[PDB]
């Protein structure tokens, strides 16, 4: 604790540049820090959590403040379909005059926003820059508060005990009823009091919200139980959003489908959704036994779920202790569920646009889908990484004897071998069918293509009421008890939306959609295979039966026993990242091309070209690259210059990653030795001495540095393309 | 914007002065 890093004496004693790198890379692995106790670990994490939350509120503050100060929110409200929202001003003294003009948006040099903040803020009732700014100040206070809380809870009297941190039943009650439930109840309050009034051109703010009742009938219906009153007189189908013209009085409805003007969910549906959700969460958070002698014990629930056959051995006996005592098990489950939520957000927000006019902001739609699927992809890789770490660091076989978790390890070869089978099957046949299609199309015979109708997915569209395919099942059947039950509620609005081919609600699907879905299945299964193999072999294999003794991350076990490069569970994380990027690539390529085709009104292009891979390269990548790569050229530059420059930058970063991934350490260490030699023997230069002996990056470090360049290049390349291709085209 | 001078002060600060100060501070911190 007398040289960086203070938390590792083993690193601090390292006389080489490795000390600095490993200091940075291990700074947050609190468990492995010198003299770390379980109590200090939890308390450090809790305080770090306050830091991270404060960061989220400062970032959000920044976005509100920049739009308030430098944006065109007020001008965008006036004309949301034509006006481009501004992110923030550019001040760059490297700009030539031509670049200042190219990026001039009105009277300001500025970036256009593709984050959808204007659409969201406008939908939730924000109407002017002073309201945004008030938001910014409000969130600076929230940041400051969390920084105070963070600071308080690492002061001796305010450090919570380990028993506090392992109070599962209490945290679940509060998080369900309070964090989810009451937040959703309070948010309902915002929609009913502020957002819905704002949608009907009625200003409700801090100035008047005490006096201005969000419904004419007040709270008399709510206490008399005459709740139908709140659903009467919804906004007409002629309602001009932000105005009273065709406005209703309803605050809670079940209209289904879209506001025809804003092509977004009804605010009164979203109000009533959140009321329903709030109640479900408040009830759900009264499940678990705290201090009042009612509710469930989570251990008692788990221990009871042992099938009497003995087919799951001891069932869930021991799982309670295993989960409660492992932060990595907890982080794994949390990342797994959050990943799924992030993917569901991506899928549901494009299909059922919540925000006024954002269906028309094509760049924002594409940006948001892509952003969230890459976050979801990172989260699920992380979930499995912490699954693997859990197995090495926290899993005790003796405490999990013959339970569901121990039984996974018992048949790991059955699991891995079957994931291998499904991956091989999907890979052979998906690549096979695409290559069949490419060859017969290349030979001028597209009628010889294997074009398998996605009839199961088409049948599901028909169950939700899509008439197009000729199936008359459930909601697409007039006589179904499913149809008749919903006819007076959401079904008219929903059927209108689902049978409209202009929106993204249950897009029409054909053979193109069949093939890419099997590509997506291949990617999910293979990424899963790598991560699961990583987790189930983390503790040991036939090649390294004592792997758990070497920990999550180590270079290898040397060239003996045939050679052991990339044997650590960390190496499975490293390999899975490539497959995650590849898979999210296929997903987001598919989303983007399907939407470009829809938005152009040339669905036929996607339908015909998507069934062979040259179609993707030519009609998606090559065709849509033109606006991007002409951001600058010999004749001049335009506002896409920054995406053109970023695009090349990202290709460079991607390719630089290959150096670290392909060329390994020994080459570099030998080269550095000659440079050290040269420096010491060069006059004048040799008066200057390094304090840290320069060495080549470590074996694992280069995998990480290579993967970061690869990942950054991968993401920035696609970001520049998906933005510039969409912005350039519309 | 209203305070259109501010980017002329803060972008150099965040972009040149503060990164040099931070690099200088971290250099001394990791070399002592």
């Amino acid at each position: 604790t007398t040289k960086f890093p203070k938390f590792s004496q083993a690193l601090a004693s390292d006389p080489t540049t490795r000390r600095i790198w490993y200091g940075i890379a291990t700074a947050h692995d609190f468990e492995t820090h010198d003299g770390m106790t379980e109590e200090n670990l939890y308390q450090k994490i809790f305080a770090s959590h306050f830091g991270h939350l404060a960061l989220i509120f400062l970032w959000t503050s920044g976005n509100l403040f920049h739009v308030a100060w430098q944006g065109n929110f007020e001008q965008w409200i006036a004309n949301p379909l034509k006006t481009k929202p501004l992110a923030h001003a550019i001040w760059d003294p490297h700009f030539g005059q031509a670049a200042l003009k190219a990026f001039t948006r009105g009277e300001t040099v500025a970036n256009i926003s593709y984050s959808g903040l204007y659409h969201w803020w406008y939908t939730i009732g924000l109407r002017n820059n002073v309201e945004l700014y008030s938001g910014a100040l409000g969130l600076l206070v929230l940041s400051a508060v969390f920084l105070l809380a963070g600071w308080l809870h690492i002061q001796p009297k305010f450090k919570p005990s380990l028993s506090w941190f392992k109070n599962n039943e209490s945290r679940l009650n509060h998080h369900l009823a309070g964090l989810f439930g009451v937040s959703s109840l309070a948010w309902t309050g915002h929609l009913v009091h502020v957002a819905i009034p704002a949608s009907r051109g009625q200003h409700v703010g801090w100035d008047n919200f005490i006096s201005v009742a969000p419904h004419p009938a007040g709270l008399q219906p709510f206490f008399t139980g005459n709740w139908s009153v709140y659903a009467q007189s919804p906004d007409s189908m002629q309602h001009v959003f932000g105005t009273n013209q065709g406005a209703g009085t309803a605050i809670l409805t079940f209209l289904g489908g879209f506001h025809p003007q804003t092509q977004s969910l009804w605010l009164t549906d979203m109000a009533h959704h959140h009321l329903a959700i709030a109640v479900i969460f408040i009830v759900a958070g009264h499940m678990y036994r705290t201090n009042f002698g009612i509710g469930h014990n989570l251990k008692t629930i788990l221990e009871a779920h042992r099938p009497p056959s003995g087919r799951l051995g001891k069932g869930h006996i021991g799982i309670y202790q295993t989960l409660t005592n492992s932060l990595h098990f907890q982080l794994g489950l949390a990342l797994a569920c959050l990943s799924v939520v992030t993917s569901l957000v991506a899928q549901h927000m494009y299909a059922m646009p919540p925000y006024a006019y954002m269906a028309y902001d094509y760049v924002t739609q594409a940006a948001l889908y892509t952003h969230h699927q890459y976050i979801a992809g990172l989260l699920i890789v992380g979930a499995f990484a912490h699954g693997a770490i859990f197995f090495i660091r926290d899993y005790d076989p003796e405490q999990n004897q013959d339970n569901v978790l121990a039984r996974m390890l018992t048949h790991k070869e059955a699991i891995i071998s079957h994931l291998s089978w499904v991956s091989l099957f999907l890979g052979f046949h998906t690549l096979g069918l695409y290559v069949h299609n490419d060859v017969v199309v290349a030979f001028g015979n597209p009628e010889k293509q294997i074009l398998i109708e996605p009839i199961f997915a088409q049948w599901i569209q028909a169950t939700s009421g899509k008439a197009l395919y000729g199936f008359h099942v459930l909601l697409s059947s007039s006589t179904s008890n499913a149809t008749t039950a919903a006819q007076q509620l959401w079904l008219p609005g929903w059927l209108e939306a689902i049978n409209n081919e202009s929106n993204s609600l249950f897009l029409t699907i054909g053979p193109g959609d069949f093939l890419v879905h099997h590509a997506i299945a291949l990617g999910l299964h293979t990424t899963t295979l790598i991560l699961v193999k990583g987790a189930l072999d983390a503790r040991g294999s036939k090649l390294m039966p004592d792997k758990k003794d070497f920990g999550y991350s180590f270079p290898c076990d040397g060239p003996g026993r045939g050679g052991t490069c990339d044997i650590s569970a960390w190496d499975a994380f490293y390999l899975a990242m490539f497959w995650m990027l590849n898979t999210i690539g296929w997903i987001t390529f598919y989303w983007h091309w399907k939407h470009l085709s829809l938005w152009q009104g040339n669905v036929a292009q996607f339908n015909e070209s998507s069934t062979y891979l040259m179609g993707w390269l030519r009609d998606y990548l090559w065709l849509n690259s033109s606006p991007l790569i002409n951001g600058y050229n010999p004749y001049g530059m335009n506002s896409l210059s920054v995406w053109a420059w970023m695009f090349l930058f990202a290709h460079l970063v991607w390719a630089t990653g290959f150096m670290f991934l392909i060329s390994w350490r020994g080459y570099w260490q030998e080269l550095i030795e000659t440079l050290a030699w040269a420096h010491e023997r060069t006059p004048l230069a040799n008066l200057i001495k390094w304090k840290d002996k320069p060495v080549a990056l470590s074996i694992v470090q280069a995998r990480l540095v290579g993967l970061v360049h690869f990942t950054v290049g991968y993401i920035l390349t696609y970001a520049a393309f998906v933005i510039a291709s969409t912005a350039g085209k519309f | 914007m209203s305070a259109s001078y501010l980017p002329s002060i803060l972008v150099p600060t965040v972009g040149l002065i503060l990164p040099f100060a931070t690099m200088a501070i971290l250099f001394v911190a990791i070399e002592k």
């Binding site: 400062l58 403040f65 820059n129 100040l137 600076l140 400051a144 920084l147 | -």
Partner: peptide, 28 residues
């Protein structure tokens, strides 16, 4: 429109967050 005063009020509150952030950072 956001006034010079409003931008400077934001900066003093951001300064306060800076102070409280350094206080937390120094302790963690």
């Amino acid at each position: 429109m956001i006034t010079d005063n409003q931008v400077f009020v934001a900066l003093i509150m951001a300064l306060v967050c800076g102070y409280l952030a350094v206080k937390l950072a120094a302790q963690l």
